[PDB]
Amino acid sequence: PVHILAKKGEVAERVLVVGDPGRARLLSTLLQNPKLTNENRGFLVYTGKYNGETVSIATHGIGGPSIAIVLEELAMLGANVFIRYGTTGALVPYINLGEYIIVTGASYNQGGLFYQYLRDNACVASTPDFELTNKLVTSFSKRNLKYYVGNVFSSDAFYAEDEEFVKKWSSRGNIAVEMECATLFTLSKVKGWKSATVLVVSDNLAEELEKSVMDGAKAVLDTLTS
Amino acid sequence: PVHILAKKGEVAERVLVVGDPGRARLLSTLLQNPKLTNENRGFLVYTGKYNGETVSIATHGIGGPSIAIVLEELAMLGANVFIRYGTTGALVPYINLGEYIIVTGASYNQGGLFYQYLRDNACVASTPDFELTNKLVTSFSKRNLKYYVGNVFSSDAFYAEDEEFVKKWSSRGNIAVEMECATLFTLSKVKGWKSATVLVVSDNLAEELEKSVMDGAKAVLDTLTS
Amino acid sequence: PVHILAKKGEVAERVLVVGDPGRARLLSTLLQNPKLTNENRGFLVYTGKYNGETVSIATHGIGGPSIAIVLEELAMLGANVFIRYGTTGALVPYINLGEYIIVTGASYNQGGLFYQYLRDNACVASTPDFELTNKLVTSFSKRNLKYYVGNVFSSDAFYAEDEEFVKKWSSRGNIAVEMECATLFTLSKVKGWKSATVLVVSDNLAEELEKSVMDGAKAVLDTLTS
Amino acid sequence: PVHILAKKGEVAERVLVVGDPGRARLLSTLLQNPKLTNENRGFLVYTGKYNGETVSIATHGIGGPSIAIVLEELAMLGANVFIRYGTTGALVPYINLGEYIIVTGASYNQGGLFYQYLRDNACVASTPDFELTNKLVTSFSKRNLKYYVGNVFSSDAFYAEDEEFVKKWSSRGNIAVEMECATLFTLSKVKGWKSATVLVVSDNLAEELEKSVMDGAKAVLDTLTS
Amino acid sequence: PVHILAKKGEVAERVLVVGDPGRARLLSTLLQNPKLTNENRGFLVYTGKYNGETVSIATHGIGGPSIAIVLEELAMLGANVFIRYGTTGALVPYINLGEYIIVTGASYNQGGLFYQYLRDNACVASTPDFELTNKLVTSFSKRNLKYYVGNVFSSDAFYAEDEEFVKKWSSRGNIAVEMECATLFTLSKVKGWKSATVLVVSDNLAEELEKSVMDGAKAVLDTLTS
Amino acid sequence: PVHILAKKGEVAERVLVVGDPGRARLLSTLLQNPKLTNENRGFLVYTGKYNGETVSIATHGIGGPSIAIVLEELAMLGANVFIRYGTTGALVPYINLGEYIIVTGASYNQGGLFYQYLRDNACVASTPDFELTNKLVTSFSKRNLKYYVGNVFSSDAFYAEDEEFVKKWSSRGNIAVEMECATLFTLSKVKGWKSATVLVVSDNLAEELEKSVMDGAKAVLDTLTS
Ligand SMILES: O=c1[nH]cnc2c([C@@H]3O[C@H](CO)[C@@H](O)[C@H]3O)n[nH]c12
Ligand SMILES: O=c1[nH]cnc2c([C@@H]3O[C@H](CO)[C@@H](O)[C@H]3O)n[nH]c12
Ligand SMILES: O=c1[nH]cnc2c([C@@H]3O[C@H](CO)[C@@H](O)[C@H]3O)n[nH]c12
Ligand SMILES: O=c1[nH]cnc2c([C@@H]3O[C@H](CO)[C@@H](O)[C@H]3O)n[nH]c12
Ligand SMILES: O=c1[nH]cnc2c([C@@H]3O[C@H](CO)[C@@H](O)[C@H]3O)n[nH]c12
Ligand SMILES: O=c1[nH]cnc2c([C@@H]3O[C@H](CO)[C@@H](O)[C@H]3O)n[nH]c12
What we know:
Six copies of one chain form a homohexamer. Chain A has 226 residues and is of the alpha/beta class. In chain A, 33% of the residues lie in helices and 30% in strands. Chain A has a single domain, classed as 3-Layer(aba) Sandwich (Rossmann fold), CATH 3.40.50. Chain A has helices spanning 21-28, 64-76, 112-118, 130-142, 165-170, 181-191, 208-224; strands at residues 14-18, 32-38, 45-50, 53-59, 81-90, 100-107, 147-154, 174-178, 194-204. Residues 19, 62, 86-89, 177-180, 202-203 of chain A line the site of one formycin B. Chains A, B, C, D, E, F: Belongs to the PNP/UDP phosphorylase family.
């Protein structure tokens, strides 16, 4: 690995992955005896214990290209179970800020990264691990957290203009927009890793937030160690 | 409606859809007082009772174009819940003939039918209803049936050659091949229908068959009338 | 073959193919000593004689994927000359219901089936056999039937919405819309089969029918046996 | 028009188009009272009479973009019937040099010119006018000339390397390769022009020529004026 | 070589390429003892002296397919440095007729010629030789000529309609439109040739022309013989 | 802006952009009185003076999606001149480690980000600002630094397998591989920003390094303030 410099045996098999370096640090606090195993290129990685299991929390940055690099190197260091925990913008009216979205699949525009990895333009089913996702539902339900289950659109361009954006994607079965689930799910299927995702609704395109992010992390950590 | 000439209030809200008219007929013998509500163009549709609830069994033929038409017409006729039940070819070594596969997503090559409906070549997530699918898993498990859960490749060409066929699609996270799940799933997300799929393995690319079919149908019907 | 279970030696080299099973049964009365050689999956196939020659009438269902399978298997059973007879929707105002359209080519949206068979997205000329097509023109002329000669658009989505459908395809040299000639013409070119198509206009998007359907059928049988 | 600067009334409705300027000059001697109506950009255009009708012979250069411009402008000058006469490379072993190929359709790789004109990547049937094409067959038959009828591949890159060129295009129903009929057929279908093509086999990729070229030309002129 | 029939040692290493045979001839009067080394298919090529150095002026016709063939054959005949010199249509308001544009890159629609050469649809950078281009800027500046530097769109369809044409390509960083720079630049990068382009503005989409052409040619020739 | 929280009037019009957060900090040391204006999400941004001009050094992370977000927000805060300074892997043998590459254009696979921003799949010329790039050449030459001028390939997948990678891209006119130049150049052309790039060769796919990175930064800063 040339980006994540952690030592082999310093990254757990179970990994909670977030996009924001600051969130990684904030959440490392939920682990027992956390140790910073990497800071190179800004990708903060912490390793500690939880519910009697070793777990790592890693930063993946923004976008398909970035998370692909991070996931590939973590895997080379021993990780094989990944749970994405990030933020998202809801595409439907009935979902409120601070509530969660457990992802069942990801829509995406083809090309680039997908072409290079897949070899052609086939629309390969971009979905998470079935078993793991149900465990997420079970952990969020037990902690009495308000969530919804559905697909999301993994955009590559945050600021690209598209006047019919919300209508187009929501009419396509997607309930929220984010940027790296398609890459995670598809690469995981190709490489044989077990993956899933839960998102915190931070905006609706159709201190209370800190609480929401903290509560969701506990459910995810519970899942990762179940 | 110019293909399925059924009268008003003759098609149930819940529908078990199969590709072979032969199976539609055979399976209708599991209902209470089955009536043939359509035979036009060979698309057999039966409506009767099961566990006290009204339900229908319909023929969709082979291919995306065929099942799209049948689904659109049944929907106009009042249907909104669909569970496809057919046969598939495994793409992995460990699955035996007669066992079952509960579909979690569908891979496909873009163009044609998808382009006309979606209006562009975006890879929209082609997945079943989360809830309904979990119900199928429970039904099949309750009846002690052997099943696997995963994605499948929806092919458009039964006889097209591909020397790398099996390793290609199996390395892409697909455990079996069939021909209409992608159409069913995508159109359902767009139209707002609740769909799922269960397949009977009739061959593995990597009397006893009618019994396997019979047992699985009972589990599916328990789910539609649950 | 796994769909059409007729015994080799039960399928004629000359085949008239129709999408509707009902039409196959009705047109079999035009043959001498008709015999049912297959009913599996609703794909009715009748074989008999017509003016000194053995001829078969087969059902192909709806859509490219369906007719592809049927065509492949009939060929494996000995067929090499196919003339499709079906219904179509006129795209130009001057054509009346009941009249016929003798097809000279097919336009199609690429992808799926064509990609699997051709292996890339090249627009391979989808045309019928030149000779066989002129023989059809002669037969229809001999029976004093009104017809037009032109290209058609082979759609995959009967119900997909397109606010500019008629103008778009008519301005592209097409005079009618159907769903399987492009698959028929292309696969025939690749496999070495001799194929052609005549359609009955059942509606214009821009008793009488029975007789129309019957007269046309006689014209097709003459062509196949001259 | 900015390329062909002939005065309207100097271009016949009936036009025989050839890629080579030299060929245009040589074939003009076949007309009665030939007059040079344009030489701008090397696009030689001659107009005269042939068996009771006014006819023009025009140069179209090499490639789809070139012939597109020339065809558009000749039309703006009054032309509506185009018959291209050129050279071609046979893709099947049985065709000999000097023989002719009467084109029934054109295969092409999509993009560029087709995308700008059609506005998307649909594979619009690229075929000639059915009637005009049969008239050519009749003329060549009347002069006892040896010909074959079939599809051709319209290439854009004469020198691009493809180790499986012959096998690929021949297995796709094409019997020869050229460079501009696809552009000719498609634009004619969209613009409402009546077009056709006959080619002289100058080589097989799988004195005698002069006379071949001359006899064929007489056959084309008869067709254009009958 | 079957298009340009020049003898050995008749084509110079440096070549000024223009699309119009008329200009090739006219421009050859700026050379010392010009000789016509090819007229086949209308592709005029002259070779003579300028500022003591041997150089050639060649006709490439219209369109990517045409210029690709001419460039490949001149290269086989010994040429390896190419400077295209032609006319263009400005896409911005501030550029006046008669002024010049030194090309820094070329935009284009994929497919056709590019697919056959590149073997896939990757957007390969279509740019001129850095060094040669800087030399043109210096030559033109030394001769006090008014020029602009920027990218251009290489169209394949002079007459295709596009109501958003100007704002589309101008908003994409292109300041003018022509038809062969993309082919010239891309093929040069692939074959290892040194190319550049200078265009004379003959119209703006947002006697005195032959003088503008004459002045610019001198600057180009100074560059080729520099 | 929601990622870069700097205040308006806290980001300069001239910006040196690097991918690595650590490099940003390392280089801020070359500025007079540097001030950290942003740390959110790990995107370090410093603002200070150099050669009598205000300049900012900003972190862009890895990949097209990431840099697009950063560039768009910096622009909203007042930046309009960007010079990319990163690392790259050489695709040609003759380029040594620690030497530099001044970029003249970027090759890229289409789709995703480009599709969303461009609206279709046109291969838009992805090039830097002409004037700015020449100034880079002038600054590196004056500091006696060894550099090469050429195009690069902007990959989206660092670890995707491609056995013919070096040959394919180098034969396409690219001398090095990196990941965000295509996005920078194209977005800059669309938005009207002035951009350029210089890369430090850290690997060749065909303390001394610290010195190399430091020396190159001085040349870039000289350019940005010239
Ligand atoms: O519209 C949106 N709203 C809220 N969050 C996001 C996000 C996620 O948050 C990050 C933006 O900083 C991205 O990496 C992405 O995963 N994407 N799109 C949206
Ligand atoms: O490889 C295979 N094996 C077994 N069954 C199928 C099937 C399904 O069976 C039907 C006929 O083969 C199709 O409509 C399809 O859904 N497809 N592909 C395969
Ligand atoms: O618009 C239309 N009008 C009339 N007939 C058809 C048909 C044909 O009839 C069947 C569906 O009604 C298809 O298999 C097709 O061949 N398709 N589209 C049309
Ligand atoms: O392989 C070939 N053999 C013979 N003639 C041609 C031609 C025709 O001749 C010209 C180039 O020699 C083109 O304009 C084209 O129409 N193209 N390709 C071939
Ligand atoms: O819009 C335009 N205006 C002026 N000249 C051209 C040209 C160039 O002039 C030739 C004929 O129009 C072409 O080969 C092309 O290179 N293309 N497009 C335009
Ligand atoms: O093959 C390579 N070698 C050296 N550097 C790079 C880089 C650049 O370095 C970063 C990797 O950390 C990427 O953001 C990219 O711009 N990409 N590809 C290569």
